[PDB]
Design a protein around this ligand. Sequence first.
Ligand SMILES: CS(=O)(=O)c1nccn1Cc1cscn1
Ligand SMILES: CS(=O)(=O)c1nccn1Cc1cscn1
Ligand SMILES: CS(=O)(=O)c1nccn1Cc1cscn1
Lengths: 39, 156
Amino acid sequence: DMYIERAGDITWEKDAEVTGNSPRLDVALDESGDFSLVE
Amino acid sequence: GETTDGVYRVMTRRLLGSTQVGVGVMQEGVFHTMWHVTKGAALRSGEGRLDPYWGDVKQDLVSYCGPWKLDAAWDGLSEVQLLAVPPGERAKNIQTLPGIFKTKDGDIGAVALDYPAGTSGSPILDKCGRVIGLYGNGVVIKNGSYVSAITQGKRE
Ligand SMILES: CS(=O)(=O)c1nccn1Cc1cscn1
Ligand SMILES: CS(=O)(=O)c1nccn1Cc1cscn1
Ligand SMILES: CS(=O)(=O)c1nccn1Cc1cscn1
């Protein structure tokens, strides 16, 4: 049996760590909810 | 059970010890997570039971106790925050500028951040603290890195 436990409030944090790039990708979404790259 | 708004871990005791299989959002008395985290199974909150109310495998979303309530959208311009809730680790905000998934049915925001699979369902937020979607359904790219769609439901 799966169970849930609270982990925090949902709030924006000022001066959070900033990372990650912003790729623009061509993708396909199938009937099973899987994304795949189109090339 | 606990019904306070917030981000929650989704755990199971089926495997070794207590294992985190994902994360979700409690808002307006409804629990929101990705379909692949629970497979649509019922959940426990203390002595209370949460039954599935709506779900869709293609969207990879599911709501419990009521209809999907989250309706904020990425503005397509600004940085957002992933409120990552990794297994065994404290909730932590990570700021990023989303990229884009371009599909035959329109464009979706996407976040290029790497976390364990049990982080799926963690919320992505705008600067007003609104949940614009959930992290955890995406693709593996050319260098082995992970890029998640910003997956959002529809408030009926
Ligand atoms: C490409 S990226 O910078 O989004 C990334 N690469 C590995 C992990 N993450 C996110 C991250 C970096 S430090 C804490 N979290
Ligand atoms: C991505 S992972 O599976 O190595 C991982 N294990 C625990 C947390 N993370 C994510 C992380 C934070 S900073 C670099 N990696
Ligand atoms: C890059 S991957 O998809 O092969 C992966 N392997 C371990 C974790 N994840 C990433 C993840 C985070 S939330 C859903 N999936």
